[PDB]
Design a protein around this nucleic acid. Structure first.
Ligand code: FE2
Length: 872
DNA sequence: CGCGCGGGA
DNA sequence: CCCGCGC
């Protein structure tokens, strides 16, 4: 977020052009440009981006999400004068309080109303109790009294809550998540009346949003229940309609949930007073709100002065009436526990699968349990983010390791003297040069060997935010504190300022976008500034300066070591990237052999990534839910091979585990933090769906492919990429590029990079080849959605039962196809999918997890094992 | 192989 | 919409 400016995020279904006009008028009076954007997946995008201290200055969303944001410290406290607060209705301010603090400005107010056909029903009923008799009349006329969405409890809750239901008890400025109001007599009475309506055929238990909307807008039912978003559609129809107070139940008003569109201020915003002034003096005025409202209607409004104007529309007046008789929707993330439990209870009670009493008894206890576990997982997440490696660092160990490293440097120097230079395998390594193309030979059936630098330029210098560590003492400090043990005397360590790293990340994605999401001139310009580390073994540590926001979340209350280097004091270090050079031998034989076995046996699924950026082959423990009949680990070819093999059903599973474990073993010898990361993030329920004793569940494979610069947001904390070559020839380009670290390299005999793929922008330049040479690239990574879904399937059916279910589902689908054709087989699979989906959601509702994940971002931590350094 | 159908959200 | 799947 740039100082002296305002950027606003607001959903696409809003009046952003009108809002942009208010910005226009604001820029005119102040000189401060206001840019209005409507990103996709806005509800998810804001907490993900603001968690890194970036994103908009102002966010527009339903107030209920803003309590979760406040828990995460994403929002600035709002400080309106009492004179300003008087201009908005008092209950709208209650909607934007968290822990006694105002956290947003209310804008608009929405709630469900009763919508009725004036021609079928000139005087709509005041009571729910009237509706049975009224439906008898209209049934005689070939019509019905009432149709509304019965599938979503947002819609049925106003009746259920009328006589006493509630979500969480509110008291002393806080919701008590132990106190759920789902199982009291009021709730029971309301749901009973609802199910009696279905029991007496006045409503259909299958009625959903689309069925009700179509029936009301076609003149077939006299009433529906909907919000202001539905008025447009009714306005295109022939129906003469009104909007009024919801019916009472037992003389009490129906209690719809109230949603308040609100404007929050990013805690990481340099422009908080500019934001406050724009919101208080430009938007929250009649002129302001009208400009927005003319673009797309706001519905009811929080500003008393404009609401008095709008309320001349009786539909708006009714909205505010229903809203004032309703309950503000609780603004805490545990509402998800509430929603799932009540949705289940209403569906079961409407289908007779449970009595009303059993349905609500179980929703009550289930919602409370899920909300409690939700809290417990949030606190556990803080422990994993702040976890520390087993301590091997000390001042004595530092110094001894510094001696051994200094000895190894002399020995490597002497060995370089005796050989005439530095070599990685057979490849001559000279850091004075950048390796732009190079030759490989294939003298035998082993892997092709990198032999000769072909095209080069002088090697660009390191960027200024990246520093090679010269001191063996500092080398030993970081090695012992971070669980990195690179080849003695034959590696280079680097320190990278965390703030510049983040700026450079953003510049790299800016360049990729400007190029049209490809390697074009802007990405090339950055590549020309990257320093080649081809043939080197290196590690990059980032240093986060103690806040006296950010992408990185070190705990500066954790234990502190004394650095030999004074400049680390007041900072935390983490490992962002490491490049290894694996000596060809037994391990490389095993790995290459498994790739060959899996290719020959057709076990890779071929997919396209990033539109048509490149082609990628995948294997591993996927769960492809797009495949309706998938109910076990692996791609569809893997499911099939277990049944169709006439030798050994698990053969490809053995191959995959050896492949992941062998790559993992090679990496773990150098990076002892890797098994610590595995042990920390993989749950007991996730472990059977990893590949062996690793943090890998998915493995990719690419053949002479470039890849645009990007981040892998849905993967683990660290990712492993390797390359190996087949056949001889010359490759130009194809470098792996880490532009925010300012480095690139050509993979040689068997280069491996281990890096934080969710937070370091990276990519592979396109390549050109001469001869038959093939560069095979492969990522081993954690794709957490698959392990979560599989862990959930495991909890629902039993881990070992998945193969049996998978075999049965394959057989039942083949049978249908062979008997009744392709369309029948697709119908069997769709049925399987909905059965699978229901089971997964139930386990997901029970907080069953394969991996630990950030509750705020829905992703894995940006880094782990931060080490604080302090030198008094 | 292409392009259909498909799930989840 | 997308590091699937099957006609
Ligand atoms: Fe990647």
């Amino acid at each position: 977020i740039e100082e002296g400016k305002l950027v606003i995020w607001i959903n696409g279904d809003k009046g952003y052009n009108g809002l942009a006009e208010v910005g226009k008028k604001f820029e005119k009076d102040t000189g401060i440009k206001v840019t209005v954007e409507h990103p996709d997946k806005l509800e998810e995008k804001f907490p993900q981006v603001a968690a890194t201290g970036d994103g908009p200055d102002i966010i527009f969303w339903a107030h209920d999400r803003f309590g979760g944001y406040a828990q995460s410290g994403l929002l600035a406290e709002i400080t309106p004068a009492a004179a300003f607060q008087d201009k908005l209705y008092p209950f709208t301010w209650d909607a934007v309080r968290y822990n006694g603090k105002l956290i947003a400005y209310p804008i608009a107010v929405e709630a469900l109303s009763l919508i009725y056909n004036k021609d079928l029903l000139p005087n709509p009923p005041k009571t729910w109790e009237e509706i049975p008799a009224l439906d008898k009349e209209l049934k005689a006329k070939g019509k019905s009294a009432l149709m509304f969405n019965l599938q979503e409890p947002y819609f049925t809750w106003p009746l259920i809550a009328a006589d006493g239901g509630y979500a969480f008890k509110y008291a002393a400025g806080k919701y008590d998540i132990k106190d759920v109001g789902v199982d009291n007599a009021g709730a029971k009475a309301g749901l009973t009346f609802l199910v009696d309506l279905i029991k007496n055929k006045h409503m259909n238990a299958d009625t959903d949003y689309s069925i009700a909307e179509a029936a009301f807008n076609k003149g077939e039912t006299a009433m529906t229940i909907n919000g202001p978003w539905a008025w447009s559609n009714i306005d295109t129809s022939a129906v003469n309609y009104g909007v009024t107070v919801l019916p009472t139940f037992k003389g009490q008003p129906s209690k719809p949930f109230v949603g308040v569109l609100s404007a929050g201020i990013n805690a990481a915003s340099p422009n908080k007073e500019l934001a406050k002034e724009f919101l208080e003096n430009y938007l929250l005025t009649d002129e302001g709100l009208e400009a927005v409202n003319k673009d797309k209607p706001l519905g009811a409004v929080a500003l008393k002065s404009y609401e008095e104007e709008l309320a001349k529309d009786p539909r708006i007046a009714a909205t505010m009436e229903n809203a004032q008789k309703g309950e503000i929707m609780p603004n805490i993330p545990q509402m998800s526990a509430f929603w799932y439990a009540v949705r289940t209870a209403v569906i079961n009670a409407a289908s007779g699968r449970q009595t009303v009493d059993a349905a609500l008894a179980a929703a009550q206890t289930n919602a409370a349990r899920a909300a409690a576990m939700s809290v417990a997982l949030a606190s556990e997440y803080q422990l994993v983010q702040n976890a520390q490696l087993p301590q091997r660092w000390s001042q004595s160990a530092r110094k001894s390791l510094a001696i051994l490293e200094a000895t190894a440097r002399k020995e490597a120097t002497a060995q370089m003297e005796a050989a005439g230079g530095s070599f990685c395998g057979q490849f001559p390594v000279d850091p004075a040069f950048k390796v732009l193309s190079l030759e490989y030979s294939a003298p035998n059936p082993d892997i092709a060997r990198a032999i000769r630098r072909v095209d080069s330029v002088p090697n660009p210098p390191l960027p200024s935010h990246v520093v090679a560590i010269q001191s063996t003492a500092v080398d030993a400090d970081l090695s012992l504190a971070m669980g990195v043990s690179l080849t003695p005397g034959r590696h280079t360590s680097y320190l990278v300022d965390a703030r510049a790293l983040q700026q450079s990340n953003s510049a790299a994605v800016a360049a990729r976008k400007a190029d049209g999401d490809k390697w074009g001139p802007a990405c090339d310009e950055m590549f020309r500034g990257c320093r080649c580390v081809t043939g080197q073994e290196v590690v990059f540590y980032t240093a986060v300066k103690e806040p006296a926001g950010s992408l990185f979340k070190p705990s500066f209350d954790g234990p502190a070591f004394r650095p030999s280097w004074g400049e680390l004091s007041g900072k935390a270090t983490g490992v962002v990237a490491c490049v290894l050079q694996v000596p060809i031998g037994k391990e490389t034989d095993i790995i290459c052999a498994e790739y060959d076995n899996l290719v020959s046996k057709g076990q890779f699924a071929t997919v396209d990534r990033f539109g048509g950026d490149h082609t990628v082959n995948m294997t591993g423990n996927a769960l492809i839910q797009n495949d309706g009949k998938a109910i076990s680990k692996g791609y569809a070819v893997a499911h099939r091979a277990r049944v169709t093999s006439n030798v050994y059903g698990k053969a490809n599973d053995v191959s995959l585990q050896r492949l992941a474990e062998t790559v993992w073993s090679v990496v773990e010898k150098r990076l002892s933090f890797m098994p610590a990361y595995r042990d920390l993030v993989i749950t007991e329920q996730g472990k059977p769906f990893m590949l062996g004793a690793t943090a890998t569940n998915i493995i990719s494979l690419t053949e002479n492919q470039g890849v645009m610069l990007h981040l892998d947001t849905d993967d683990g904390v660290w990712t492993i990429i390797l390359w190996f070559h087949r056949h001889s020839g010359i490759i130009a380009g194809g470098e792996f590029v880490l532009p925010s670290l300012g480095i690139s390299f050509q993979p040689l005999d068997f280069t491996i990079v281990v890096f934080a793929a969710n937070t370091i922008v990276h990519g592979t330049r396109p390549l050109q080849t001469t001869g038959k040479i093939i560069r095979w690239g492969s990522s081993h990574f954690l794709r957490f959605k698959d392990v979560n879904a599989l862990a959930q399937l495991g909890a629902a059916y039993g881990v070992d039962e998945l193969d049996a279910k998978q075999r049965d589902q394959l057989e039942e689908v083949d049978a249908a196809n062979s008997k009744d054709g392709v369309g029948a087989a697709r119908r069997v699979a769709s049925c399987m999918a909905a059965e699978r989906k229901a089971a997964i959601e139930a386990q997901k509702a029970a907080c069953v997890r394969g991996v630990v994940m950030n509750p705020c971002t829905g992703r894995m931590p940006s880094l782990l094992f931060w080490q604080v350094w302090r030198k008094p």
